[PDB]
């Protein structure tokens, strides 16, 4: 949050970058710094006695301009401190234990006592119960409960099964159980967590082109105001005595867009902080803004419908087999399928049709996995001879044991093939019990996620490429308005370059290495933490929550940053009319007494109005530090309505809030009797 | 009287619209490099003789062409004005002009400024104002229309690297827009009473006995192309207020329509070249709202007028001081604000002899940049300078990459846009500061108090803004004034033309995005109000310190 009162003293120590070496990088406030030093030495000589006057006015102006600089650097340093706190929260302990390396890759091999900071590519390491992953990589065999709360915020014990859709691991996370091996993929210091910590600690923050263009407009505006307030001196010298240098410098610093000039770094440092707080590791603010400008979104069904391979069961159709006999077959299958995916099929069948006639205790079923030569179940302890295999597997079983197969199983396989799902057949005894329907279900709330995407006007294209009918069904109960059946990598590259060549911007959220070239060719690249390592370096940003629709949050924050900076610079520009109405009649009351009818605020004195303006200039910055931290509230509106809302809030805040601020500060000064 | 002003503004705008909309269909034809109906054979037998190659050239060669043509024009005009005694058509045998006045007049006439620091009928021969002044009155407008044609071609071309050919551009624009409409306007002025005779200065004995002397010459021929475009340098010292230039109210209406004809037709051509007339009517509304508001405040200020006249025993208090007789208070006020809105520089009423509130507004519409139909050719690109910033701010409020008419806008033209916007107030404020840190400039004062500083600010704004309209109290015949205004004129023309051409070259390469569902429509009342707010915000935030010590100070006196 804003002020935890933990590191505020440290960041206030870090405010002191007042030396010119660390200040010329922001010219719109280097002008403020030079003006502050100039009015400070004017105040010093003024109190010494080179020129006659009170010198308390000049001393107060010099102090308050230094105060404006100090709160600008305070905003920047507080944003940097929040970024450092986020980086230290994501730090964990990278080097926490010696690595259990093996000279030869095999479970139960020669152990090692090597430290966890020199492991190279292709290094195998054993992980036992109650351990922690040293460095990122992939598993080879085995797997158990792995918790990633200390890295990603997810305390769910996500398993790491060998191969398959997810087999990659990240270093620095707790391991709860035994039977984990890890093959190293990248060296320490090549991972994205360490890269994010390095770029936060380095704090270079190469500015986005939008940031550079906004800085260019701020520079143009401060050149304009500098020349106006500099040429104001001969015009005043023409009529009577000229306006003093202190008043000119204070008016200049008031006119300079000081608020956005101070919060320009914070808008973007808080952007990186909100990247890291949304479980996303982002490389560049240009990538963040391009992700905020996504119009076309791309996905695959391998990460949407129960993350693939865990499709549900639908009534198990069969010819000549009654529903109760099919339920008995489901029970006999529930007394089998010792694989994890097989047990998933078992529990889906049980929740489809619960049956409690016999269990694992009454029927002592042999718990054996499949055989690699035929994908066959080794269970034979029941009354019927049980086989769990595919079509070719069960044909080989027929000419291995039963002899000749009928055409009923062939036509049932044909019906299943034309209806979709998977052609895996459950067989007990010498008769088939029907091909199990294994149509998938769209897990989660991806329907309303796609509804939110369509409300935000982002195209959602779903690219897996199985067949046109099941892609149409997946679109129907998913929410994507189109898809791409019969998908190949060259077709993906052609489609993405056609979208990029039609005048639209795209984004990919792939996981595998096959679509990694297309994902890297995309100008916005979202990498999957559960996805492959090579695709993770091929990406631009990676989301650590294993959520395909994290891009909606990425669009939210990326648009929030641009909206915040544009709104703040418009507010800073719009305050200048009120700053004129406060300063100019007071600034020229000495030599143009006829101008004393312009201060419609009915301010007290010329020596008080300028102080009130500079105090308002400092206090608006320190009050808008929370607006720099937390961005402008995004609502899913159209362009015209959102521009109208931004105008009605912030442009109306300009020319009205400075009225109240200057009047209240002048009233407080008169009450305190300082002026 | 307020109702008379209301109908005056209304019918002037209706006649301007119905005369400018058909010119858009025909200026977009010139933009598209499509010959007008009935001149293809004349074009193909003309350009072969002239050596104008049909091949197109990029922004660098286009800009080099325009600047070389302007340098040649400046050299020819300078060496003609330094002579004019070795040259014919000098019936009164006028002497050769001084070097400083010749340089200032030459740069004023070539850089679309037309600022007269002299008396024309007693300083210039017939030949200068017939040939050398008139060719610059033609080619400055032609160069401005060529620059905006390059910008419009850059906006409408998808991914080409060329902006067309400048030589054929100015040739076609001049010979088929600027010449024949000038013939029509000139013959109308001969019909109504403006003279063009080439006769020697004919002395007249009046009915009383005081032998005066009348001036003659090619007055209406220069008048027609001085009104077409936005040139605004007259034959005499009282430019477009002498009865020999605009004798009556119908002539003055033709003056007004010729002032606003080319920028309004250019806006219509910009609307019709994209296939979306909303994109042009957006700019037309954004200009016209500011225009009519400023007309209203000027007429109200001049109707309030001089308060001392009622206390000095007069039947009314309208500021007839320094205003014509057959042109009313409202009519001369409208011509003042039209002149200083469209960068013309021809004044009916002497702008120096205005009420403070009615004299601040011409200064304001000059100093904000020539955006409200401002300048021939300049009236669109000076407004595009503010459009490319308003759409940037609007895209920042949306939270997307800022794009105008599909093409993305980035740093590589944000630098040029910022430079081209700030080059104008830099010149205005630096010149107004230099004119008061020297004895000269501060010593050419005619009126004391804040009105003198208002005079100096108006003069330097007119020099830097290519207007030419004058608070004529300032005696700018001094070499310091001539050199300062010459430098301001030169930089205020070619520090705006160059970055506009660079923006065009950077923009023509970028492929235009076709359409999207979520981009901000830059045609509606919201965008019109945003552009108007930008124009009234920056351009006033610059000069409120400058305007407070002059007209505001003497108004609150």
């Amino acid at each position: 949050l804003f002020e935890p009162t933990l590191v505020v003293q440290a960041l206030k120590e870090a405010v002191k970058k007042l030396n010119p070496q660390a200040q010329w990088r922001n010219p719109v406030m280097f002008i403020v710094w030079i003006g502050s030093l100039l009015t400070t030495c004017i105040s010093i000589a003024m109190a010494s006695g080179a020129m006659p006057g009170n010198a308390l006015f000049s001393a107060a102006i010099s102090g308050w301009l230094w105060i404006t600089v100090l709160f600008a650097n305070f905003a920047e340093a507080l944003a940097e401190g929040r970024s450092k706190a986020q980086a230290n929260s994501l730090k964990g302990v990278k080097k926490t234990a010696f690595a259990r390396k093996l000279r030869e890759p095999k479970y139960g091999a020669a152990a090692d006592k090597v430290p966890a900071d020199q492991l190279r590519k292709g290094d195998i390491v054993l992980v036992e119960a109650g351990d922690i992953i040293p460095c990122d990589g992939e598993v080879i065999e085995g797997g158990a409960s792995v918790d990633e709360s200390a890295i990603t915020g997810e305390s769910a014990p996500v398993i790491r099964e060998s191969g398959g859709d997810f087999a990659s691991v990240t270093g620095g996370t707790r391991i709860l159980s035994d039977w984990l091996v890890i093959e190293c993929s990248v060296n320490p210091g090549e991972t994205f967590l360490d890269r994010m910590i390095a770029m936060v600690e380095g704090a270079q923050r190469r500015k986005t082109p939008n940031e550079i263009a906004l800085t260019i407009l701020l520079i143009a505006l401060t050149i304009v105001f500098l020349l106006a307030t500099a040429t104001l001196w001969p015009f005043s010298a023409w009529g009577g005595n000229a306006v003093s240098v202190t008043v000119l410098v204070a008016l200049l610093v008031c006119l300079i867009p000081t608020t956005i000039g101070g919060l320009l770094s914070a808008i973007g440092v808080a952007g990186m902080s909100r990247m890291l707080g949304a479980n996303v590791i982002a490389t560049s603010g240009r990538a963040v803004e391009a992700a905020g400008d996504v119009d076309v979104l791309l996905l695959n069904k391998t990460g949407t419908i129960t993350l693939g391979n865990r499709q549900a069961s639908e009534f198990i159709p069969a010819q000549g087999v009654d529903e109760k006999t099919l339920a008995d077959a489901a029970q006999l299958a529930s007394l089998a399928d010792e694989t994890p995916e097989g047990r998933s099929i078992v529990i889906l069948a049980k929740q489809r049709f619960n049956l409690r006639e016999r269990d694992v205790q009454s029927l002592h079923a042999t718990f054996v996995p499949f055989t690699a030569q035929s994908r066959m179940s080794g269970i034979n302890i029941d009354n019927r001879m049980i086989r769990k295999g595919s079509v070719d597997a069960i044909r080989r079983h027929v000419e291995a044991n039963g002899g000749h197969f009928p055409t009923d199983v062939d036509q049932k396989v044909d019906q299943v093939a034309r209806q979709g799902a998977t052609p895996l057949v459950v067989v007990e005894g010498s008769r088939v019990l029907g091909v199990i329907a294994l149509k998938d279900i769209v897990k989660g709330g991806i329907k309303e996620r796609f509804a939110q995407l369509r409300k935000m006007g982002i195209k959602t294209v779903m690219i897996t490429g199985d067949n046109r009918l099941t892609a149409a069904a997946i679109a129907a109960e998913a929410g994507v308005d189109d898809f791409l059946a019969e998908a190949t990598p060259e077709a993906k590259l052609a489609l993405i370059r056609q979208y990029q060549a039609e005048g639209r911007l795209v984004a990919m959220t792939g996981d595998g290495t096959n679509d990694a070239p297309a994902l890297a060719q995309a100008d916005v690249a979202v990498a999957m933490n559960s996805g492959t390592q090579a695709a993770k370096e091929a990406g631009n940003m990676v989301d650590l929550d294993s959520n395909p629709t994290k891009l909606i949050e990425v669009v939210h924050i990326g648009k929030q940053m641009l909206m915040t900076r544009g709104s703040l610079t418009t507010f800073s520009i719009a305050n200048d009319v009120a700053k004129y109405f406060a300063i100019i009649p007071a600034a020229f009351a000495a030599t143009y007494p006829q101008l004393n009818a312009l201060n419609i605020m009915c301010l007290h004195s010329p020596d008080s109005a300028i102080l009130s303006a500079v105090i308002f200039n400092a206090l608006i910055i320190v009050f808008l530090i929370p607006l720099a931290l937390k961005g402008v509230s995004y609502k899913p509106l159209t362009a015209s309505a959102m521009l109208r809302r931004n105008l009605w809030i912030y442009g109306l805040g300009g020319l009205l809030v400075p009225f109240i601020g200057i009047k209240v500060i002048d009233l407080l000064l008169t009450v305190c009797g300082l002026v | 009287m307020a109702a008379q002003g209301f109908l005056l503004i209304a019918t002037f705008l209706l006649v301007l619209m119905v005369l400018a909309r058909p010119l858009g269909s025909g200026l977009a034809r010139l933009i598209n490099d499509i010959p007008l109906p009935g001149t293809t054979g004349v074009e193909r037998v003309l350009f072969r003789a002239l050596g104008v190659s049909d091949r197109e050239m990029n922004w660098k060669q286009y800009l080099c062409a325009i600047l070389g043509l302007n340098m040649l024009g400046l050299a020819v005009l300078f060496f003609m004005l330094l002579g004019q005694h070795y040259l014919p058509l000098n019936p009164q045998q006028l002497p050769g002009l001084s070097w400083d006045l010749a340089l200032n007049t030459a740069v004023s006439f070539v850089t679309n400024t037309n600022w007269q620091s002299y008396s024309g009928e007693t300083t210039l021969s017939y030949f200068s104002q017939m040939a050398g002044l008139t060719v610059q009155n033609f080619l400055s407008a032609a160069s401005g229309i060529a620059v905006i044609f390059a910008l419009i071609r850059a906006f409408t071309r998808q991914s080409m690297s060329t902006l067309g050919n400048a030589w054929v551009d100015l040739l076609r624009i001049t010979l088929w827009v600027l010449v024949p409409v000038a013939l029509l306007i000139a013959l109308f002025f001969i019909q109504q009473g403006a003279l063009q005779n080439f006769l020697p200065y004919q002395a007249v004995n009046t009915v009383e006995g005081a032998q005066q002397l009348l001036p003659m010459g090619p007055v209406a021929s220069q008048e027609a192309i001085k009104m077409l475009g936005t040139n605004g340098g007259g034959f005499f010292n009282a430019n477009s207020s002498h009865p020999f230039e605009n004798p009556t109210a119908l002539t003055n209406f033709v003056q007004m329509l010729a002032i606003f004809l080319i920028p309004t037709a250019l806006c219509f051509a910009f609307g019709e070249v994209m296939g979306d007339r909303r994109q042009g009517r957006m700019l037309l509304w954004a200009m016209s709202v500011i225009f009519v508001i400023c007309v209203g405040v000027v007429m109200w200020a001049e109707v309030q007028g001089n308060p001392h006249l009622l206390a000095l025993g007069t039947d009314s208090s309208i500021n007839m001081e320094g205003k014509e007789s057959r042109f009313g208070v409202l009519v001369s006020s409208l011509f003042a604000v039209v002149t200083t809105a469209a960068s013309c520089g021809a004044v009916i009423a002497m702008h120096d002899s205005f009420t403070a509130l009615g004299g601040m507004v011409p200064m304001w519409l000059m100093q904000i940049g020539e955006v409200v139909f401002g300048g021939v050719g300049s009236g669109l690109y000076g407004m595009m300078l503010f459009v490319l910033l308003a759409v940037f701010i609007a895209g920042l409020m949306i939270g997307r990459t800022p794009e105008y008419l599909g093409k993305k806008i980035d740093v590589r033209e944000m630098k040029l846009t910022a430079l081209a916007i700030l080059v104008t107030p830099t010149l205005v404020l630096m010149g107004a500061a230099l004119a008061m840190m020297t004895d000269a400039g501060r010593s050419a004062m005619l009126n004391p108090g804040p009105h003198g500083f208002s005079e100096v600010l108006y003069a330097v704004s007119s020099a830097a803004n290519n207007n030419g309209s004058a608070f004529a109290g300032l005696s700018a015949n001094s070499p310091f004034w001539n050199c300062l205004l010459a430098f301001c004129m030169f930089v205020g023309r070619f520090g705006v033309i160059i970055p506009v051409m660079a923006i065009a070259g950077s923009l023509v390469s970028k492929k235009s995005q076709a359409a999207s569902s979520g981009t901000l429509p830059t045609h509606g009342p919201l965008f019109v109000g945003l552009l108007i707010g930008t124009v009234l915000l920056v351009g006033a935030l610059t000069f409120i310190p400058a305007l407070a010590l002059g007209p505001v100070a003497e108004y609150l006196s």
Binding site: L38, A220 | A418
Partner: peptide, 27 residues
């Protein structure tokens, strides 16, 4: 004109040069 304002003019020109340099630069 006199002394004491030439340093102000020089410092204003120096600030303008630095600001134009920052405008052209993409630092």
């Amino acid at each position: 004109m006199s002394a004491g304002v030439i340093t102000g003019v020089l410092l204003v020109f120096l600030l303008l040069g630095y600001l134009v340099y920052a405008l052209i630069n993409a630092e």
